[PDB]
Amino acid sequence: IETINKLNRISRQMLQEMGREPTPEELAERMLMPEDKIRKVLKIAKEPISMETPIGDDEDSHLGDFIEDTTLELPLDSA
DNA sequence: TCTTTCTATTATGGTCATGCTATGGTACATACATTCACAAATGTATGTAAACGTAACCTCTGTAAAGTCATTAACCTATGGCACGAAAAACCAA
């Protein structure tokens, strides 16, 4: 959490000074960190999505749809 | 001793189904050990030879049962010879 907050403050200061997106190559050149570590820290940090997420205007389109369970295998393979 | 005027939860359907997914940040300094990841050695492992025995297995001579053909004589068409029963001639009675 400390490293994520430090990289967020450095990215905010870099977007304030430069004026474009915080490309991680300049962060790796500044904080002397390897680039794959910066990719890993930027990839892990993400908040999960809730199980309802109202998409449409009507109360018919919610979750419990488009998500499948891969444990239940095919009946043809069992046959 | 008793009926109205207010303060809060339930309720009305789903079937035919839709697209594109995140939204603002807010400190570091010692610390000691659990865990991942490689060196190097054990141990049982697998795959290459070599010996015995019978899975046998064809080859050949002897015993045995089955088609056929030597006898020999039983019956059977022939031949000769003698009864036999039919067909015609004869003669008698009415």
PDB file of C-alpha atoms (C1' of nucleotides) in Angstrom:
ATOM      1  CA  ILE A   1       0.000   0.000   0.000  1.00  0.00           C
ATOM      2  CA  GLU A   2       2.922   2.344   0.740  1.00  0.00           C
ATOM      3  CA  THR A   3       4.574   1.661  -2.635  1.00  0.00           C
ATOM      4  CA  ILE A   4       1.226   2.047  -4.444  1.00  0.00           C
ATOM      5  CA  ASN A   5       0.634   5.402  -2.711  1.00  0.00           C
ATOM      6  CA  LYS A   6       4.172   6.555  -3.570  1.00  0.00           C
ATOM      7  CA  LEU A   7       3.743   5.581  -7.231  1.00  0.00           C
ATOM      8  CA  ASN A   8       0.339   7.305  -7.307  1.00  0.00           C
ATOM      9  CA  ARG A   9       1.819  10.533  -5.920  1.00  0.00           C
ATOM     10  CA  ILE A  10       4.747  10.378  -8.369  1.00  0.00           C
ATOM     11  CA  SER A  11       2.349   9.689 -11.263  1.00  0.00           C
ATOM     12  CA  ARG A  12       0.118  12.594 -10.198  1.00  0.00           C
ATOM     13  CA  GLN A  13       3.107  14.952  -9.953  1.00  0.00           C
ATOM     14  CA  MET A  14       4.375  13.746 -13.341  1.00  0.00           C
ATOM     15  CA  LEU A  15       0.970  14.259 -14.982  1.00  0.00           C
ATOM     16  CA  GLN A  16       0.849  17.720 -13.392  1.00  0.00           C
ATOM     17  CA  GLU A  17       4.321  18.717 -14.614  1.00  0.00           C
ATOM     18  CA  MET A  18       4.396  17.096 -18.064  1.00  0.00           C
ATOM     19  CA  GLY A  19       0.700  17.193 -18.988  1.00  0.00           C
ATOM     20  CA  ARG A  20       0.144  13.690 -20.401  1.00  0.00           C
ATOM     21  CA  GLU A  21      -0.235  10.082 -19.195  1.00  0.00           C
ATOM     22  CA  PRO A  22       2.237   8.723 -16.602  1.00  0.00           C
ATOM     23  CA  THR A  23       4.349   6.394 -18.742  1.00  0.00           C
ATOM     24  CA  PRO A  24       6.138   3.965 -16.373  1.00  0.00           C
ATOM     25  CA  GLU A  25       9.509   4.164 -18.173  1.00  0.00           C
ATOM     26  CA  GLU A  26      10.190   7.587 -16.648  1.00  0.00           C
ATOM     27  CA  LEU A  27       9.095   6.217 -13.257  1.00  0.00           C
ATOM     28  CA  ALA A  28      11.584   3.359 -13.645  1.00  0.00           C
ATOM     29  CA  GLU A  29      14.334   5.796 -14.659  1.00  0.00           C
ATOM     30  CA  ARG A  30      13.528   8.084 -11.715  1.00  0.00           C
ATOM     31  CA  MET A  31      12.936   5.654  -8.818  1.00  0.00           C
ATOM     32  CA  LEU A  32      15.666   3.237 -10.120  1.00  0.00           C
ATOM     33  CA  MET A  33      13.159   0.329 -10.090  1.00  0.00           C
ATOM     34  CA  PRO A  34      12.947  -2.412 -12.742  1.00  0.00           C
ATOM     35  CA  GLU A  35      10.175  -2.080 -15.300  1.00  0.00           C
ATOM     36  CA  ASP A  36       8.623  -5.514 -14.679  1.00  0.00           C
ATOM     37  CA  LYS A  37       8.190  -4.659 -10.989  1.00  0.00           C
ATOM     38  CA  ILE A  38       6.341  -1.475 -11.991  1.00  0.00           C
ATOM     39  CA  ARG A  39       4.162  -3.551 -14.340  1.00  0.00           C
ATOM     40  CA  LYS A  40       3.428  -6.001 -11.509  1.00  0.00           C
ATOM     41  CA  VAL A  41       2.506  -3.255  -9.023  1.00  0.00           C
ATOM     42  CA  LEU A  42       0.306  -1.525 -11.617  1.00  0.00           C
ATOM     43  CA  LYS A  43      -1.330  -4.870 -12.493  1.00  0.00           C
ATOM     44  CA  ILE A  44      -2.105  -6.113  -8.956  1.00  0.00           C
ATOM     45  CA  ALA A  45      -3.702  -2.873  -7.713  1.00  0.00           C
ATOM     46  CA  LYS A  46      -7.352  -3.048  -8.822  1.00  0.00           C
ATOM     47  CA  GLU A  47     -10.619  -2.951  -6.891  1.00  0.00           C
ATOM     48  CA  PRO A  48     -13.004  -5.884  -7.517  1.00  0.00           C
ATOM     49  CA  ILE A  49     -16.461  -5.444  -9.051  1.00  0.00           C
ATOM     50  CA  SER A  50     -19.685  -6.145  -7.131  1.00  0.00           C
ATOM     51  CA  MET A  51     -22.150  -8.927  -7.941  1.00  0.00           C
ATOM     52  CA  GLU A  52     -25.109  -6.750  -8.949  1.00  0.00           C
ATOM     53  CA  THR A  53     -23.810  -3.925 -11.261  1.00  0.00           C
ATOM     54  CA  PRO A  54     -27.016  -2.483 -12.826  1.00  0.00           C
ATOM     55  CA  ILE A  55     -26.322  -2.108 -16.544  1.00  0.00           C
ATOM     56  CA  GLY A  56     -29.639  -1.348 -18.225  1.00  0.00           C
ATOM     57  CA  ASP A  57     -32.480   0.951 -17.263  1.00  0.00           C
ATOM     58  CA  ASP A  58     -34.936  -1.882 -16.570  1.00  0.00           C
ATOM     59  CA  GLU A  59     -34.720  -4.253 -13.602  1.00  0.00           C
ATOM     60  CA  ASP A  60     -34.004  -7.298 -15.751  1.00  0.00           C
ATOM     61  CA  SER A  61     -30.321  -6.944 -16.708  1.00  0.00           C
ATOM     62  CA  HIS A  62     -28.131  -7.750 -13.707  1.00  0.00           C
ATOM     63  CA  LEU A  63     -25.410 -10.313 -13.028  1.00  0.00           C
ATOM     64  CA  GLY A  64     -25.806 -14.052 -12.714  1.00  0.00           C
ATOM     65  CA  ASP A  65     -25.525 -13.856 -16.496  1.00  0.00           C
ATOM     66  CA  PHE A  66     -22.573 -13.989 -18.998  1.00  0.00           C
ATOM     67  CA  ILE A  67     -20.491 -15.635 -16.226  1.00  0.00           C
ATOM     68  CA  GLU A  68     -20.160 -19.417 -16.409  1.00  0.00           C
ATOM     69  CA  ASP A  69     -18.658 -22.044 -14.116  1.00  0.00           C
ATOM     70  CA  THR A  70     -15.966 -24.200 -15.720  1.00  0.00           C
ATOM     71  CA  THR A  71     -16.010 -26.974 -13.098  1.00  0.00           C
ATOM     72  CA  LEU A  72     -19.151 -28.588 -14.548  1.00  0.00           C
ATOM     73  CA  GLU A  73     -17.783 -30.360 -17.612  1.00  0.00           C
ATOM     74  CA  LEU A  74     -19.491 -31.514 -20.785  1.00  0.00           C
ATOM     75  CA  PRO A  75     -21.933 -34.472 -20.856  1.00  0.00           C
ATOM     76  CA  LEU A  76     -20.389 -35.599 -24.148  1.00  0.00           C
ATOM     77  CA  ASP A  77     -16.998 -36.099 -22.480  1.00  0.00           C
ATOM     78  CA  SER A  78     -18.661 -38.132 -19.717  1.00  0.00           C
ATOM     79  CA  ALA A  79     -20.427 -40.205 -22.386  1.00  0.00           C
TER      80      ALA A  79
ATOM     81  C1'  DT B   1     -65.701   4.472  30.230  1.00  0.00           C
ATOM     82  C1'  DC B   2     -64.976   4.684  24.171  1.00  0.00           C
ATOM     83  C1'  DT B   3     -64.309   5.967  18.052  1.00  0.00           C
ATOM     84  C1'  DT B   4     -61.384   9.467  14.833  1.00  0.00           C
ATOM     85  C1'  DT B   5     -56.479  12.102  13.501  1.00  0.00           C
ATOM     86  C1'  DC B   6     -52.106  11.365  13.302  1.00  0.00           C
ATOM     87  C1'  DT B   7     -46.727   7.662  12.863  1.00  0.00           C
ATOM     88  C1'  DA B   8     -44.585   3.565   9.968  1.00  0.00           C
ATOM     89  C1'  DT B   9     -44.153  -1.576   6.811  1.00  0.00           C
ATOM     90  C1'  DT B  10     -46.157  -4.676   2.991  1.00  0.00           C
ATOM     91  C1'  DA B  11     -47.879  -4.305  -2.122  1.00  0.00           C
ATOM     92  C1'  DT B  12     -47.814  -5.327  -8.990  1.00  0.00           C
ATOM     93  C1'  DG B  13     -45.912  -9.878 -13.974  1.00  0.00           C
ATOM     94  C1'  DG B  14     -42.373 -11.935 -16.625  1.00  0.00           C
ATOM     95  C1'  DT B  15     -41.762 -13.372 -20.316  1.00  0.00           C
ATOM     96  C1'  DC B  16     -39.068 -11.875 -25.995  1.00  0.00           C
ATOM     97  C1'  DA B  17     -33.978  -9.542 -24.413  1.00  0.00           C
ATOM     98  C1'  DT B  18     -30.282  -5.136 -25.140  1.00  0.00           C
ATOM     99  C1'  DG B  19     -24.629  -2.873 -24.652  1.00  0.00           C
ATOM    100  C1'  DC B  20     -19.317  -0.848 -22.384  1.00  0.00           C
ATOM    101  C1'  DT B  21     -17.103  -1.013 -17.053  1.00  0.00           C
ATOM    102  C1'  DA B  22     -14.448   2.596 -13.105  1.00  0.00           C
ATOM    103  C1'  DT B  23     -15.288   6.356  -9.437  1.00  0.00           C
ATOM    104  C1'  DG B  24     -10.447  11.782  -5.959  1.00  0.00           C
ATOM    105  C1'  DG B  25      -5.980   9.873  -2.070  1.00  0.00           C
ATOM    106  C1'  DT B  26      -3.657   9.964   2.449  1.00  0.00           C
ATOM    107  C1'  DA B  27       4.668   8.465   6.224  1.00  0.00           C
ATOM    108  C1'  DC B  28       8.652   6.402   6.912  1.00  0.00           C
ATOM    109  C1'  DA B  29      12.769   3.626  10.150  1.00  0.00           C
ATOM    110  C1'  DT B  30      14.965  -0.978  12.386  1.00  0.00           C
ATOM    111  C1'  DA B  31      13.468  -5.986  12.765  1.00  0.00           C
ATOM    112  C1'  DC B  32      13.887 -10.973  12.536  1.00  0.00           C
ATOM    113  C1'  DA B  33      12.376 -15.116  10.395  1.00  0.00           C
ATOM    114  C1'  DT B  34       9.248 -17.962   6.976  1.00  0.00           C
ATOM    115  C1'  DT B  35       9.527 -19.327   2.208  1.00  0.00           C
ATOM    116  C1'  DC B  36      11.171 -20.013  -2.817  1.00  0.00           C
ATOM    117  C1'  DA B  37      15.119 -21.528  -5.599  1.00  0.00           C
ATOM    118  C1'  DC B  38      19.147 -23.780  -6.701  1.00  0.00           C
ATOM    119  C1'  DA B  39      23.929 -27.102  -5.474  1.00  0.00           C
ATOM    120  C1'  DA B  40      24.968 -32.366  -4.549  1.00  0.00           C
ATOM    121  C1'  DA B  41      24.234 -37.277  -3.055  1.00  0.00           C
ATOM    122  C1'  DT B  42      21.172 -41.750  -2.070  1.00  0.00           C
ATOM    123  C1'  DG B  43      18.366 -45.123  -3.415  1.00  0.00           C
ATOM    124  C1'  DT B  44      15.956 -48.212  -5.829  1.00  0.00           C
ATOM    125  C1'  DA B  45      15.196 -48.280 -10.947  1.00  0.00           C
ATOM    126  C1'  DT B  46      14.993 -49.571 -15.604  1.00  0.00           C
ATOM    127  C1'  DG B  47      17.183 -52.274 -19.748  1.00  0.00           C
ATOM    128  C1'  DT B  48      21.209 -55.407 -21.853  1.00  0.00           C
ATOM    129  C1'  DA B  49      23.212 -60.399 -21.599  1.00  0.00           C
ATOM    130  C1'  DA B  50      23.034 -65.899 -20.537  1.00  0.00           C
ATOM    131  C1'  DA B  51      21.307 -70.895 -18.810  1.00  0.00           C
ATOM    132  C1'  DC B  52      17.381 -74.907 -18.422  1.00  0.00           C
ATOM    133  C1'  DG B  53      12.926 -77.013 -19.901  1.00  0.00           C
ATOM    134  C1'  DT B  54       9.171 -78.103 -22.512  1.00  0.00           C
ATOM    135  C1'  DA B  55       5.518 -75.313 -24.953  1.00  0.00           C
ATOM    136  C1'  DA B  56       6.601 -79.678 -28.441  1.00  0.00           C
ATOM    137  C1'  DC B  57       6.682 -81.829 -33.964  1.00  0.00           C
ATOM    138  C1'  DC B  58       7.707 -84.309 -37.933  1.00  0.00           C
ATOM    139  C1'  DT B  59       9.315 -89.021 -39.147  1.00  0.00           C
ATOM    140  C1'  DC B  60       8.438 -94.221 -39.465  1.00  0.00           C
ATOM    141  C1'  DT B  61       7.032 -98.941 -38.311  1.00  0.00           C
ATOM    142  C1'  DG B  62       3.366-102.024 -36.398  1.00  0.00           C
ATOM    143  C1'  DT B  63      -1.739-103.214 -35.155  1.00  0.00           C
ATOM    144  C1'  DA B  64      -6.473-103.038 -36.797  1.00  0.00           C
ATOM    145  C1'  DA B  65     -10.915-102.500 -39.551  1.00  0.00           C
ATOM    146  C1'  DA B  66     -12.833-101.801 -44.088  1.00  0.00           C
ATOM    147  C1'  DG B  67     -13.849-101.944 -49.195  1.00  0.00           C
ATOM    148  C1'  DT B  68     -13.189-106.152 -52.762  1.00  0.00           C
ATOM    149  C1'  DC B  69     -12.512-110.791 -54.952  1.00  0.00           C
ATOM    150  C1'  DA B  70     -10.574-116.547 -55.049  1.00  0.00           C
ATOM    151  C1'  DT B  71     -13.845-120.632 -54.135  1.00  0.00           C
ATOM    152  C1'  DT B  72     -18.512-123.616 -54.513  1.00  0.00           C
ATOM    153  C1'  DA B  73     -22.978-124.684 -55.228  1.00  0.00           C
ATOM    154  C1'  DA B  74     -28.479-122.986 -55.273  1.00  0.00           C
ATOM    155  C1'  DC B  75     -31.559-122.120 -58.075  1.00  0.00           C
ATOM    156  C1'  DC B  76     -33.124-121.546 -62.855  1.00  0.00           C
ATOM    157  C1'  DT B  77     -33.654-120.596 -67.921  1.00  0.00           C
ATOM    158  C1'  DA B  78     -33.233-124.483 -71.007  1.00  0.00           C
ATOM    159  C1'  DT B  79     -33.924-129.768 -73.166  1.00  0.00           C
ATOM    160  C1'  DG B  80     -36.699-134.471 -73.462  1.00  0.00           C
ATOM    161  C1'  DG B  81     -40.709-137.320 -71.969  1.00  0.00           C
ATOM    162  C1'  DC B  82     -45.242-138.535 -70.276  1.00  0.00           C
ATOM    163  C1'  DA B  83     -50.087-137.346 -68.293  1.00  0.00           C
ATOM    164  C1'  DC B  84     -54.202-134.030 -69.126  1.00  0.00           C
ATOM    165  C1'  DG B  85     -57.997-131.664 -70.418  1.00  0.00           C
ATOM    166  C1'  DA B  86     -60.288-129.572 -74.317  1.00  0.00           C
ATOM    167  C1'  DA B  87     -62.498-130.020 -78.946  1.00  0.00           C
ATOM    168  C1'  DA B  88     -64.468-132.481 -82.465  1.00  0.00           C
ATOM    169  C1'  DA B  89     -66.282-137.027 -84.505  1.00  0.00           C
ATOM    170  C1'  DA B  90     -69.564-140.830 -83.594  1.00  0.00           C
ATOM    171  C1'  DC B  91     -73.734-143.172 -82.385  1.00  0.00           C
ATOM    172  C1'  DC B  92     -77.993-143.996 -79.562  1.00  0.00           C
ATOM    173  C1'  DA B  93     -82.656-142.579 -77.564  1.00  0.00           C
ATOM    174  C1'  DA B  94     -87.037-140.300 -78.361  1.00  0.00           C
TER     175       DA B  94
END
